[PDB]
Amino acid sequence: ALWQFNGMIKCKIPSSEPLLDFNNYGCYCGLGGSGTPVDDLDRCCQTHDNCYKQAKKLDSCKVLVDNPYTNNYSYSCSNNEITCSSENNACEAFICNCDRNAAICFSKVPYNKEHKNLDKKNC
């Protein structure tokens, strides 16, 4: 699963989408990439990955399905805010906090269109 993430960034920023702006940017935003960041926005993505790791260390996550990807959580948007099914257990709630915390950073940090599509040779 993944399309759910874009939704989190769509709620915080309805006037702009990630796949149509923050797509393939910095060395952490997007899906892969790696190495020194390029701006404050890239730092947010670099942290998104760090959150999926913390989720694996969690006990509940340790005995679930050894895979924070197939784990799809339910959520919703409203008042420029993200809504996540409270039923989400410890792991389900942590995975949502990771995607939600990522959309909040993009809206709290600036975005350089020039740093878009950076060269891994700089990372």
Q: Write the CATH number for 32.
A: 1.20.90.10
Q: Which of 40, 99, 115, 119 does the annotation list as catalytic?
A: 99
Q: What angle do CA 70, 75, 42 make, to 5 degrees?
A: 75
Cα→Cα distances 67→1, 4, 54, Å: 11, 16, 12
Q: Which one-letter DSSP state was computed for residue 77?
A: E
Q: Give the other-Cβ count within 10 Å of 82's Cβ.
A: 21
- Rounded CA separation 101/86 (Å): 16
| Residue 28 marked in a binding site | yes
Q: Which domain holds residue 9?
A: 1-123
Active site residue 99: yes
Give the count of domains, the chain.
1
> Which experimental method was this entry solved with?
NMR
- Rounded CA separation 86/121 (Å): 42
Active site residue 48: yes
Give the SS3 label for residue 83: strand
